[PDB]
Scaffold this active site. Structure first.
Site, short mmCIF file in Angstrom:
data_model
loop_
_atom_site.label_atom_id
_atom_site.label_comp_id
_atom_site.label_asym_id
_atom_site.label_seq_id
_atom_site.Cartn_x
_atom_site.Cartn_y
_atom_site.Cartn_z
N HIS A 1 0.83 -1.17 0.00
CA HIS A 1 0.00 0.00 0.00
C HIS A 1 0.89 1.26 0.00
O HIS A 1 1.08 1.86 -1.05
CB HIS A 1 -1.07 -0.08 1.09
CG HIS A 1 -2.02 1.06 1.03
ND1 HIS A 1 -2.35 1.84 2.12
CD2 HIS A 1 -2.59 1.64 -0.05
CE1 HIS A 1 -3.17 2.80 1.70
NE2 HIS A 1 -3.40 2.65 0.38
N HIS B 1 -2.83 1.33 7.34
CA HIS B 1 -4.25 1.43 7.02
C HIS B 1 -4.92 0.06 7.04
O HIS B 1 -5.99 -0.07 6.43
CB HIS B 1 -4.46 2.13 5.68
CG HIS B 1 -3.58 3.30 5.55
ND1 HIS B 1 -2.33 3.22 4.94
CD2 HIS B 1 -3.73 4.61 5.98
CE1 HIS B 1 -1.75 4.40 5.04
NE2 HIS B 1 -2.57 5.24 5.67
S1 FES Z 1 0.58 1.33 4.32
FE1 FES Z 1 -0.09 -0.71 4.74
S2 FES Z 1 -2.32 -0.52 4.65
FE2 FES Z 1 -1.57 1.58 4.03
#
Ligand code: FES
Ligand SMILES: Nc1nc2c(c(=O)[nH]1)N[C@H]1C(S)=C(S)[C@@H](COP(=O)(O)OP(=O)(O)OC[C@H]3O[C@@H](n4cnc5c(=O)[nH]c(N)nc54)[C@H](O)[C@@H]3O)O[C@H]1N2
Ligand SMILES: Nc1nc2c(c(=O)[nH]1)N[C@H]1C(S)=C(S)[C@@H](COP(=O)(O)OP(=O)(O)OC[C@H]3O[C@@H](n4cnc5c(=O)[nH]c(N)nc54)[C@H](O)[C@@H]3O)O[C@H]1N2
Ligand SMILES: Nc1nc2c(c(=O)[nH]1)N[C@H]1C(S)=C(S)[C@@H](COP(=O)(O)OP(=O)(O)OC[C@H]3O[C@@H](n4cnc5c(=O)[nH]c(N)nc54)[C@H](O)[C@@H]3O)O[C@H]1N2
Ligand SMILES: Nc1nc2c(c(=O)[nH]1)N[C@H]1C(S)=C(S)[C@@H](COP(=O)(O)OP(=O)(O)OC[C@H]3O[C@@H](n4cnc5c(=O)[nH]c(N)nc54)[C@H](O)[C@@H]3O)O[C@H]1N2
Ligand code: F3S
Ligand code: F3S
Ligand SMILES: [Mo+4]
Ligand SMILES: [Mo]
Ligand code: NA
Ligand code: NA
Ligand SMILES: [O]
Lengths: 135, 824, 824
Positions: free
Chosen positions: A64, A83
């Site tokens: 992510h 997140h």
């Molecule tokens: S950085 Fe891992 S869920 Fe956003």
């Protein structure tokens, strides 16, 4: 020129029989800024290696936005504190729920029966925060 | 192809603005486009991202994956890299991307990618086979049928189900084009909306009480003491509003800003209350972030919202935790609502199942004055758990009563707001009828000659969907059989053949879409549409922030913007009437001389409330003319919150942050109006299903899956993770039925039968389930009832059924994770 | 992905053998497979191709494009490069690849490639929607219905249309598995074949005359003086036979070899004669290669082949250009055929439209003794122009009479052979009935409870296809409607519901396929199959050369080899009968204890003619047992020509080059039998269409498109070139109808209506046309008649119709070439 593949190093991780069921080992691949985990899951999974075809390895950087994920022994997943993405260590890094658009990258291990060595030889998927897996 | 590198955008790559195609939040993105055989350097000043790829990037530096890249092939045959990534300086998302927005590049049209099966030309079912046809032929057949129907039956013979929303497959250009066509030109009242089977609103009550449903800013979620999330799973359904605004509040990162705005007010740690029968990922994540003590999950019995809000309202009134000066100066009907809505906590608890201590605590957190004397700033956010709940109109009556009495509108850090679904982008003529019509029932009953699904797919998303499909497939078949006899017919003779089959129970079905979809099982005619990036498009998000998504590539084949499809239809119909010497009918089809989408913006949004303009209902209001494409471009992804209050070249567009801050509501007298909210239990139709069958068949969204999966069905990662619609079941219930993860079940009741793969979920209550709605493999809506509220709003969340094991899908067991989606 | 480089196979890459999936010729290929993140070096000894990529390669050094590469993802999740390229040392093709075989890599299954939509699991139309289902449930429903039909109606209630061919979607394992299931176990006679609507042969006459249709070697085309191509477009339909064998002969490159074999025989420059109403790319290419003086195009009137061959036969007999000692020693019926088949050149010319001088020349080239005294070696090759011609049985009678009298079987450089379609791979039990049944007519008339299409799609390829589809769709609808009422039913109840719907006109439809196809419009059940490379498969080409295609990758999902699908059904049926205590019926379903495809090869091909074996009809004959997978592997892509004559470890498989070289034919007496061949004109059904309508609706193949385009429909290059079926039209005819290239027309007659894009072709005769058969966008077969010969062989090339302009497809004008496909 002529070359379409990345020049991955070959890095020894450990010998397979040192690994205990569901006790992750930390290492870096393909360089010291890329943290990884190998784990013996305890039961065979597709593409698992070692004597019980159950050893798997991953880049732990969330795909992510790149926080280091933690391995959860109770669920055999990698959890991102950023997140709340969660990846399945038993399904080749399949995202269970979360905001990533890529599975957790697998570190490809050769297992040599002759020596019991586990060697990291490549990466399936693109590690967070990189133009190419090999910088 | 290769999975282990990406091509960086060159420093000089073209960069355009794009709002996310998908959910309400409307996160801002940049699209980098550059020739396929160029690339950026890893040094930060040699790529368009300005990021240093000469060594590992830290966390939060970027969101970039192969799914965010693509190579497009334009109409000139030249190939261009694209990269679609979130805008770090956009106030909405601050560089966040959901898993859904993150896939935009992958879902742009390319000849070989996930968009490979995009509609590229008109498709005709010529009686016994799908073929291509020309646009002229398609318009001759489609306009010819509309014309014949208008001439012989009038408008009541021409049916539509059409988007009314924003973002992709909607927006101000598109809603105007379609609305002008349907309402001002054709003048048909036989129109329903993409998500509801009549021409109505989700928010009749709140609007009638004087409170439009999008009354605050996202910043208000940062200023709140308490957030209610009612019938809402926002981590999954409004991801980046929750991540970028709600969570920073819970974490304490906004405390400074509250105290700066309000020097003499206590700001405790923020807290969050969820009213949801089901324990969701959003509940879990809130508890991980804020702790168990700052989260209250009111796990109400399905359909008991009205009783909850009446019990809360009664209690805050008895405690005096209301704003009496506010009520006295700015409301009407309070004293009456106190009497009509009276309900004790004990009765409330018995109906909802929530213990009295938890009802009292929710009230204490939310409405009891702070030590500094002010009432908490309590933002009340709600969505489809109550919009599609047990009596839409009454629930909103009950909730808005509590909100108005506690002065939780018009103060910063408050609001009683929809969380939203799609983005918003509505500019339309008034609806031309004087009654609400249940369109699906009318089609099922054999009415109408031609039905157009436009940017929707009610095969997957209607309530009582099995009855709908049955009827449409049959009616479609009558037309197919009639066409079959023809050989060598002119277009005009074919129109006559089809018209006659519709007098015999038939229905001609058109779909205007990106893809064939399941509608292709019944459609006779499909027309190719264009999505944002293949066209300019304007829309606003859940805080009314209007942005321009800029065109950056060509559509597939002869795909067209929906507003231009509407102009094409109108101009066909006009030509036909001019040629038939009917000047008066021809004139009804004037005003579609449009060459680009911007023409539709100028004709619609920008004319609203202007001199010489017809009646126009527009989210932009009467200052919409102040917005132009150019001005939006200069605003960037931050846009402007509507309504615009002023513009000049030096200060740009200046807009409106919060509604109702002066206590003037949208009613005749400027006051907010309280409404009675009677508790009548579940509707009989629903109660009968509950009496006969075991499981509450809750339904709704999954974080990863967008809507009817029109893109996701072509995505190999999506298909591997969710090959079939899944049903969350309690493990004890699973053992009783001898099912586990990856088994297939039939779910059925009096309304229908469908299938799902079993997903054991510890957090699901015994006798309750949760199935993914709208999906391409196992349509949930088959088991929803026909029951609607007074305004024809379905209780989509209100159905019960039985469950029967089909068997074990070993392939799903090998490939699909059935691990918990509730983070801890 | 990147379009400007490829990944070379490593020197040590795994290499397996693969026969082309597609046409009869069966060109040899190698499949290189290696891990995705490895590659070979450009130096020749550092890649598996042994080619020097350090500098430009010369012409003919390689056939390699991105379309010949892919990346597969196996069941273990690991990714492997593949490269599928022609074998330079295979005798069939000598390193040639057609445009069809060349795409094999692209048409291997990958999650994101052209094979993305491959069937991966059982699909069920559960009354009103497509869903996945388990194999167990699918078998319970499918075998349950077969069992119920057997129990109440007997076998006559269970219908199939099934491949009988070789290559992909056929071959010796697969034809045995299906034939054993249909004929020995179920014992239904209600079976037709993929390309013809009864259980019959394309070659009844030649077989009955004692001449099996594959009687020579490809080397014979190299040794011939004259090649006839009758009803045949070989550059497009048997490309590499034409390119690697025929053309070298025409060019003079085989002259040495003829003269070495036959020291005292003159060998003039080779010549070629085409009997084809249409001037094809094959005719044009032959003229470019050999010159106009060495090519004779006998552009006969449609349907006049019988008259042509009777005129030629009459003439060579009157001239004495026959082999009287051969006739006397090895034939029966000559004197009778001279009388029955008598026709003057003048009458021949009047019927065929070929001038007398050209009839004489064809005879002079082909049959008049050479100066050295021997008759020319004249190879007579024929295909669908006459197999689907005006009375299949009679045309073959006429042709074989000419061939036998002139001794053009059994001598090297001769043969009267099928060119072939698919590869061959037939091993089956005898057909269990005693009559030919027109299956499509029976279905249209409402017979049958269950119909399985198995590796075919008659929606696109039946004769009188529009009647078929109309009926099947309607009958399918009855079943869907019946299923609709069910809720919560067991599999056994659902079987009952469906069976009852079939008593009311319904038909349950199953498809066993790679893809959904158009059959998905009617099917209730679809099962996933595996193609060569996902399984081991054996088949033989047009000279009987059997090869093993080696498995090298996994199938998609739970897709299975067709022979193992047949075992699965048999074992389900056995269990059901065992469970119902019916020991005798259970035993009919024994003999399918198979784990791998090789089990089917052992049980079928290798048992034929063996002691205690059942009756088995096999192209391998009774020495089939000498072939094993291991022995075929050692043979390589050169395989062995069947029948095998001997085997030992030191000499490998040794087989048969040419049949009939001792003058012993396959009749009771060992002689070849002449047959009467009456000229009766066109069939009345066809003549009536000709009388009513303007255009001869010729139909057939395009070089680039394979069959029903089941792969090509997903290939962006293919869809850009041929977005719609095209119809070649004379330009003068085009101007009369005001059409040009890229217009869409309707083509229609009393049998049906379809569509095509107009392709002006100067070489097409006025009043004639040529439409691509079998396609996904504009099915040609809608306008073919129901007429068949005495053995239910359709006159697919015999239909007339009218043509009506629909409109100009501007997009086709912009993107499709309408330039000449006849090379000069
Ligand atoms: S950085 Fe891992 S869920 Fe956003
Ligand atoms: N059981 C149950 N049913 C529900 C719900 C529920 O909670 N429970 N929710 C309801 C709600 S909230 C909604 S929003 C509806 C959704 O019901 P629909 O609106 O039917 O579903 P979507 O997937 O939004 O439909 C969008 C369609 O438009 C097409 N499309 C995309 N972009 C474009 C464009 O630019 N032009 C055109 N012309 N077409 C375009 C897509 O390919 C797709 O077919 O479902 C409703 N149904
Ligand atoms: N990931 C993702 N996000 C999307 C969408 C998508 O398809 N995918 N679609 C978008 C659209 S169009 C919309 S409308 C929004 C919808 O967003 P939401 O309304 O947040 O989502 P739903 O999942 O439909 O339903 C919300 C909750 O209602 C609860 N619920 C059910 N019955 C009741 C009841 O009687 N009372 C109460 N109080 N709660 C109840 C359910 O348990 C569920 O958690 O999401 C949008 N965002
Ligand atoms: N008008 C007209 N009609 C004709 C002809 C013509 O000349 N004129 N030609 C006729 C001739 S010669 C023929 S051969 C027929 C062709 O008629 P069909 O056999 O109906 O057509 P194919 O495209 O060969 O069908 C192959 C099908 O099997 C599927 N498939 C491929 N591989 C496999 C496999 O391993 N297993 C299984 N189970 N399925 C597989 C493909 O996806 C496709 O649906 O058409 C005939 N029809
Ligand atoms: N490119 C490609 N090659 C293929 C296939 C494919 O789909 N694509 N399919 C394969 C299959 S299954 C088959 S059966 C073969 C078919 O291969 P061929 O039979 O060579 O091909 P067709 O185009 O069907 O028809 C052959 C010729 O018959 C001519 N013709 C039509 N009517 C008559 C008539 O009355 N008399 C005579 N003398 N000629 C006539 C046509 O003008 C046409 O040129 O091709 C195989 N090879
Ligand atoms: S990326 Fe898109 S899906 Fe919603 S949360 Fe943001 S607008
Ligand atoms: S490559 Fe394939 S399609 Fe025929 S000509 Fe050769 S077997
Ligand atoms: Mo919605
Ligand atoms: Mo064929
Ligand atoms: Na259903
Ligand atoms: Na038709
Ligand atoms: O064939």
């Amino acid at each position: 020129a002529g070359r379409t593949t990345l020049q991955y190093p070959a890095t020894q991780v450990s010998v397979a029989k040192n690994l205990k069921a569901n006790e992750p080992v930390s290492f870096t691949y393909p360089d010291t800024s890329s943290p990884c985990v190998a784990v013996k899951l305890g039961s065979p999974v597709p593409g698992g290696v070692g004597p019980n075809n159950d050893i798997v390895a991953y880049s732990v950087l969330c795909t992510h936005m790149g926080f280091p994920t933690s391995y959860d022994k109770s669920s055999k997943t990698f959890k991102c504190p950023g997140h709340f993405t969660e990846f399945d260590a038993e399904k080749a890094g399949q995202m269970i729920c979360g905001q990533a658009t890529e599975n957790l990258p697998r570190v490809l291990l050769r297992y040599d029966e002759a020596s019991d060595a586990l060697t990291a030889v490549g990466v399936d998927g693109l590690i967070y925060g990189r133009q190419a897996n090999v910088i | 192809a290769p999975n282990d590198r990406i091509t960086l955008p060159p420093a000089n790559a073209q960069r355009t603005n794009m709002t996310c195609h998908f959910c309400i939040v409307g996160c801002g993105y940049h699209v980098y486009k550059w020739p396929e055989l160029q690339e950026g350097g890893r040094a930060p000043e040699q790529n368009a991202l300005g990021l240093d790829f000469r060594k590992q990037l830290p966390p939060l530096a970027v969101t970039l994956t192969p799914a965010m890249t693509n190579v497009v092939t334009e109409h000139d045959g030249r190939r261009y890299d694209i990269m679609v990534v979130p805008d770090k300086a956009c106030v909405v998302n601050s560089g966040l991307s959901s898993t859904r927005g993150g896939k935009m590049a992958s879902y742009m049209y390319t000849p070989t990618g996930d968009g490979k099966q995009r509609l590229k030309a008109p498709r005709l079912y010529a009686a016994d086979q799908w073929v291509d046809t020309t646009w002229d032929h398609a318009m001759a057949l489609y306009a010819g049928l509309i014309k014949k129907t208008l001439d012989k039956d009038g408008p009541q013979g021409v049916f539509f189900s059409c988007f009314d929303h924003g973002g992709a497959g909607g927006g101000f250009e598109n809603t105007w084009g379609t609305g002008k066509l349907m309402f001002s030109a054709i003048q048909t009242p036989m129109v329903r909306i993409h998500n509801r089977p009549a021409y109505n609103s989700e928010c009749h009550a709140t609007r009638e009480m004087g409170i439009g449903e999008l009354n605050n800013a996202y910043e208000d979620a940062q200023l709140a003491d308490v957030i209610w999330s009612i019938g809402n799973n926002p981590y999954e359904s409004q991801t980046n509003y929750f991540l970028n605004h709600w969570l920073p509040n819970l974490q304490g990162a906004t405390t400074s800003k509250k105290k700066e705005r309000f020097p003499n007010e206590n700001f405790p740690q923020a807290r969050i209350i969820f009213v949801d029968p089901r324990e969701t990922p959003s509940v879990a994540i809130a508890r991980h972030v804020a702790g168990n003590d700052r989260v209250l999950h009111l796990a109400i019995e399905p359909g008991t919202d009205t009783a909850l809000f009446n019990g809360l309202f009664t209690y805050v009134v008895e405690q005096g935790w209301i704003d009496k000066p506010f009520i006295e100066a700015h409301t009407k009907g309070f004293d009456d609502a106190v009497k009509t809505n009276r309900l004790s906590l004990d009765e409330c608890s018995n109906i909802t199942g929530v213990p009295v201590d938890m009802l009292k605590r929710a009230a204490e957190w939310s409405y009891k004055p702070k030590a500094s004397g002010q009432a908490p700033r309590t933002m009340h956010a709600y969505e489809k758990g109550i919009i599609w709940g047990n009596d839409n109109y009454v629930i909103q009556s009950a909730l808005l009563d509590l909100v108005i009495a506690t002065h939780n509108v018009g103060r910063r850090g408050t609001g009683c707001v929809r969380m939203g679904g799609h983005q918003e982008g509505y500019t339309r003529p008034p609806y031309p009828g004087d009654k609400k019509i249940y369109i699906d029932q009318e089609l099922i009953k054999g009415k109408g000659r031609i039905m157009t699904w436009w940017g929707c797919n009610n095969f997957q998303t209607s309530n009582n969907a099995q009855a709908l499909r049955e009827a449409i497939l049959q009616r479609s078949a009558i037309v197919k059989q009639a066409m079959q006899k023809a050989r060598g017919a002119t277009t005009e003779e074919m129109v006559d053949v089809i018209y006659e089959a519709t007098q015999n129970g038939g229905l001609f079905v058109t779909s205007i879409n990106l893809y064939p979809t399941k509608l292709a099982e019944a459609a006779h005619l499909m027309l190719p549409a264009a999505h944002p990036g293949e066209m300019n498009l304007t829309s606003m998000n859940g805080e009314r922030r209007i942005r321009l998504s800029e065109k950056f590539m060509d559509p597939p084949g002869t795909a067209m913007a929906d507003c231009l499809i509407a102009a094409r239809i109108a101009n066909a119909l006009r030509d036909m009437y001019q040629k038939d010497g009917k000047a008066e009918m021809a004139a009804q089809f004037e005003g579609f001389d449009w060459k680009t989408e911007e023409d539709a913006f100028n004709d619609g949004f920008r004319r609203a409330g202007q001199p010489g303009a017809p009646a126009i209902d527009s989210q932009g209001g009467s200052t919409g003319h102040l917005v132009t494409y150019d001005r939006l471009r200069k605003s960037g992804n931050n846009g402007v919150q509507l309504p615009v209050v002023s513009w000049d070249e030096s200060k740009g567009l200046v807009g409106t942050e919060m509604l109702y801050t002066e206590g003037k509501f949208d009613t005749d007298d400027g006051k907010a109006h309280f409404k009675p909210a009677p508790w009548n239990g579940l509707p009989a139709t629903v109660q009968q299903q509950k009496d006969k069958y075991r499981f509450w068949l809750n339904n709704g969204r999954n974080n990863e899956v967008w809507q009817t999966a029109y893109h996701d069905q072509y995505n190999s990662l999506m298909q591997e993770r969710y090959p079939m619609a899944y049903i969350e079941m309690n493990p004890d219930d699973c053992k009783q039925l001898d099912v586990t993860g990856g088994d297939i079940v039939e779910v059925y009741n009096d309304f229908g039968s469908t299938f799902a793969m079993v997903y054991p979920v510890a957090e699901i209550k015994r006798g309750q389930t949760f199935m993914l709605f709208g999906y391409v493999n196992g349509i949930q809506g088959d088991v929803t009832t026909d029951w609607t509220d007074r305004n024809i709003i379905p209780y989509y969340k209100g159905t019960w059924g039985d469950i029967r094991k089909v068997g074990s899908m070993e392939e799903f067991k090998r490939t699909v994770s059935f691990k918990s989606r509730r983070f801890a």
